[PDB]
Design a protein around this ligand. Structure first.
Ligand SMILES: CCNc1cc2oc3c/c(=[NH+]/CC)c(C)cc-3c(-c3ccccc3C(=O)OCC)c2cc1C
Lengths: 150, 150, 390, 48, 150, 50
């Protein structure tokens, strides 16, 4: 910075404390009362939602193995498992609706052959809707899934 | 929509190759239509004002919203918005020994907003009770204030 | 009876349900510190860690970042609950979790902490609620708008068939103003440029240059040790170089005084504005309270303006009445059949309402389509009674 | 005649009322087509 | 550093006035914080292509860019797709080789954060902390006893 | 340049809205070719030059 008359060297260390610190100290995170940081992924207007969160291999799994001693991943605030359960409960309803239909068909038609046509008539119709909605742009949405059930 | 982008994003590579007087001026890329449709005249009857008082008020209450509203390529202003106008006197500059260079430098120092910090800043000492922002210099408001520039 | 069971039935959009994940935000009073809000954030994390062990799997507290904005006054804690299988009861469900939490936060605290179910729908469309915004149309200042906003918030509370209105979060905290005597500056021999970057870089920070750290390029910042920039008395510690090669104190050219300002200034459509977040009456619903808020905005001072099932169904369903008559004649010509089916509509719908009126259900989206499906099955039931007999 | 007229959607409540109708409107067409081709065929091929 | 009254009319109002001539638009909203941060949201009609809707606002902005402070110009000007709702909030903690809620915050932003926001149409990635910076803490008494300034 | 054509100096605030500050000169001192001599410039030796 300066060299005072008597040849005395003035350095930045003398007039100022220098440390490798954060660029911003306004925000600090604590995972269960333990010092931590992380990444809060925000969606893009019109993005593929679950497909973005499942756009993986990745989505940080190539960062997952190269961590030093101590550094570990953890998962709070997550959408993923809700989608995993929303489909599973709807598909379970689907199968339950077939089996319960199968009984009423047998309870009115004692012919085992007769209680088969309506049993094998409607599984085709569902896939048709899956094929038609895909050709129209519609996805396996919370609505379109209840639409199958309805 | 895309034809606009291509010409405006190739322009912004010659932007730093232009004078800074032009850079701080209105560079505009818009959709062409050499024909008006709605030419809305704004006049005064009672509280008489000039063809400059209206021109400002139109451009400080309406013009900003119109060009934005419903895909309007560009809005034409018939006059001008108000500006802090200074009319320098050469004889009065000489009899005090001054130049327009000194005038510009005076405004570029006394008329400005300065980013001052805050008490209880980004990294505080654990135990502080107060957090308040600091106010420094502020852009001048009236003609009287501009008249009192040293 | 079919009408009454439908008109008196409340209307909602989409049911808010458990998501295994919720969140809670913190709001401190005027000019609070990072150390002050962390104390509150600590209490929030622990109620979830000790008094909610069977529910909460993990917490994620954040100090200095709310959803109204950011700063030392704000805070949030992201919550992740244990899976639904290990959360059996209704008390183990978000609705009841966010109930006793808010009850605790409103009791053993001195700040503002809430808790809410994540609106599975979208940010917009709460039903029986609105988003009001008060715009400065003339040349009035922010201080003048504040009083008109105060008058609007007062008048709705003065005569609330009620209301639930509160401001967005502008607080209005005191600011430390420094007046630099311009004449004294050049008299003592200091450049105004030098003084500005002295106060700016020391108290706020300065983006100086970029440097390289372990390959990646990072930034170089200059500021100062906290202790030299904590209080208004610390201003005098900073000495500036003058033209005659000597130091000049701040107290020489400076002037210390406090001023009343706002931490954030909202702007709606190119003009200064203030957002009013209010809900409709516990009895009324949107459309009523919305027009019963616009009359109060019109009864405000000059230069003050404003800007903000659904109406959908009245339309859509009318076309559903026109296409039916056509399709009930496109295979059934008479003017007798196109009136036979037309009766099965409220035949089933009465029970559709009844089951929703009896249980805790409401007129949501799935119910609105659960009506037409019932109508579709009712039409089927009727057509066979006609087609076979005809 | 009750679904597609209600599928004439709008605003935020767009896909909401739209998706539900068309999902079952397509399903109706497919169910009817199946009950015009497949179901009658299966019923004729093997029933009793 | 800047206060709420500064950013409002040196960064905000500059952009607000230079924000017009865009196809499809409902309104615009702004928040000028005391932390010296401003963010402006523009909402378009339902069904409008967000890909072009982004461009129109970001290429009209870049005409008011030289009308902004150079401290703001060298800072993060960003145009992104809005979605006020997180989905994947990945927590990163340490167990063995103990580090601070600043050592992790840097490493997350110097190994992962850069790739995540890029990967699979992510509007923006939120960092819970800060990346490391060359931090210098100046001493005023040590500046005086040597005769120096920041 | 600033006397005969005008100069974009800085921006100022007027009734909320941010406007521009312009510097020029009274018309009479910039009407004819003879008005050029009226403008005197500061030299390094602290004196005026026509
Ligand atoms: C009962 C519904 N039956 C359908 C039958 C169809 O048959 C098709 C035959 C073709 N033969 C060529 C001679 C081609 C090219 C496209 C076709 C499309 C089609 C058209 C436009 C866009 C996508 C597709 C499409 O189906 O492709 C998506 C994978 C199509 C669509 C539907 C709905």
């Amino acid at each position: 910075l300066k060299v005072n008359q008597d040849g005395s060297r003035v350095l930045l260390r003398d007039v100022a404390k220098i440390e490798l610190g954060g660029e911003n100290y306004d925000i600090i995170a604590e995972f269960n009362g333990q010092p931590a940081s992380g990444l809060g992924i925000k969606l893009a207007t019109g993005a593929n939602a679950l497909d973005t969160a499942a756009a993986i291999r990745a989505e940080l799994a190539k960062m997952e193995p190269f961590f030093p001693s101590g550094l570990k991943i953890v998962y709070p605030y997550d959408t993923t498992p809700f989608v995993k359960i929303s489909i599973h409960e709807v598909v379970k309803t689907l199968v339950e609706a077939i089996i319960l239909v199968f009984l009423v068909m047998y309870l009115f038609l004692q012919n085992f052959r007769a209680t088969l046509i309506p049993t094998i008539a409607v599984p085709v119709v569902l896939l048709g809707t899956f094929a038609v909605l895909a050709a129209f742009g519609f996805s396996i949405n919370t609505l379109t899934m209840f639409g199958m059930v309805l | 929509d895309i034809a606009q982008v291509q010409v405006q994003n190739k322009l912004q590579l010659a932007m730093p190759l232009l004078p800074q007087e032009v850079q701080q001026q209105g560079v505009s890329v818009e959709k062409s239509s050499s024909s008006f449709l709605m030419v809305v005249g704004v006049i005064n009857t009672d509280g008489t004002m000039t063809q400059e008082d209206i021109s400002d008020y139109v451009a400080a209450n309406m013009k900003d919203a119109i060009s934005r509203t419903s895909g309007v390529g560009d809005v034409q202003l018939f006059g001008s918005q108000y500006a802090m106008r200074i009319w320098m006197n050469p004889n009065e500059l000489n009899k005090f020994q001054l130049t327009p260079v000194d005038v510009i430098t005076a405004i570029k120092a006394q008329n400005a907003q300065v980013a001052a910090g805050q008490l209880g800043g980004t990294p505080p000492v654990k135990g502080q009770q107060l957090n308040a922002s600091i106010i420094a210099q502020t852009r001048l408001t009236s003609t009287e204030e501009f008249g009192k520039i040293l | 009876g079919m009408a009454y069971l439908f008109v008196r039935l409340p209307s909602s959009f989409l049911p808010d349900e458990d998501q295994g994940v919720f969140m809670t935000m913190v709001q401190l009073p005027a000019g609070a510190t990072q150390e002050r809000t962390q104390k509150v954030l600590n209490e929030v994390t622990h109620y979830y860690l000790t008094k909610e062990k069977n529910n909460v799997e993990s917490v994620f507290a954040v100090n200095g970042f709310g959803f109204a904005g950011r700063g030392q006054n704000t805070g949030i804690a992201f919550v992740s609950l244990k899976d639904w299988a290990d959360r059996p009861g209704e008390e183990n469900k978000v609705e009841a979790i966010t109930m006793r939490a808010t009850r605790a936060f409103s009791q053993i605290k001195d700040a503002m902490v809430f808790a809410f179910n994540l609106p599975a729908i979208v940010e917009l469309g709460t039903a029986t609620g609105f988003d009001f915004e008060l715009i400065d149309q003339a040349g009035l200042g922010h201080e003048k708008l504040t009083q008109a906003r105060n008058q609007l918030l007062a008048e709705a509370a003065k005569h609330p068939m009620l209301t639930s209105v509160r401001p967005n979060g502008l607080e209005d905290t005191p600011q430390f103003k420094i007046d630099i005597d311009q004449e004294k500056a050049q008299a003592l021999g200091v450049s105004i440029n030098d003084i500005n970057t002295t106060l700016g870089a020391a108290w706020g920070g300065s983006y100086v240059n970029d440097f390289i750290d372990r390959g990646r390029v990072k930034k170089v910042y200059v500021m100062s040790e906290a202790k030299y920039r904590m209080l208004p008395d610390d201003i005098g510690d900073w000495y500036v170089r003058a033209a005659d090669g000597q130091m000049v104190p701040f107290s020489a050219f400076s002037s210390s005084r406090w001023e009343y300002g706002s931490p954030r200034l909202e702007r709606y459509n190119g003009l200064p504005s203030m957002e009013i977040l209010g809900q409709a009456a516990p009895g009324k619903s949107t459309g009523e309270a919305m027009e019963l808020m616009e009359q109060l905005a019109s009864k405000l001072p000059t230069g003050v303006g404003y800007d903000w099932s659904g109406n959908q169904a009245p339309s859509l369903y009318a076309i559903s009445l026109i296409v039916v008559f056509l399709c009930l004649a496109a295979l059934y010509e008479s003017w007798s059949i196109p009136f036979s089916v037309m009766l099965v509509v409220p035949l089933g719908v009465i029970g559709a309402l009844l089951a929703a009126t009896f249980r805790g259900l409401t007129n949501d989206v799935y119910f609105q389509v659960g009506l037409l499906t019932t109508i579709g099955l009712s039409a089927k039931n009727a057509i066979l009674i006609v087609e076979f007999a005809k | 005649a009750v679904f597609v007229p209600m599928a004439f959607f709008g605003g935020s409540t767009g896909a909401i009322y739209r998706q539900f109708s068309i999902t079952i409107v397509s399903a109706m067409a497919l169910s009817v087509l199946v009950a015009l081709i497949l179901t009658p065929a299966l019923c004729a091929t093997m029933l009793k | 550093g800047a206060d709420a009254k500064t950013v409002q009319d040196t960064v905000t109002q500059v952009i607000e006035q230079n924000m017009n001539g865009i196809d499809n638009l409902m309104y615009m909203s702004s928040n000028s914080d005391s932390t010296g941060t401003v963010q402006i949201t523009l909402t378009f009609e339902s069904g409008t292509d967000a890909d072009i809707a982004q461009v129109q606002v970001q290429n009209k902005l870049q005409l008011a860019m030289p009308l902004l402070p150079q401290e703001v110009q060298q800072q993060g000007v960003s145009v992104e797709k809005s979605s006020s709702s997180f989905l994947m909030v990945v927590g990163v903690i340490n167990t063995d080789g103990t580090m601070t809620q600043e050592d992790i915050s840097d490493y997350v932003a110097a190994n992962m954060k850069d790739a995540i926001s890029r990967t699979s149409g992510v509007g923006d990635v939120q960092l819970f902390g800060s990346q490391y910076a060359m931090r210098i803490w100046m001493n005023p008494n040590e500046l005086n006893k040597f005769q120096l300034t920041p």
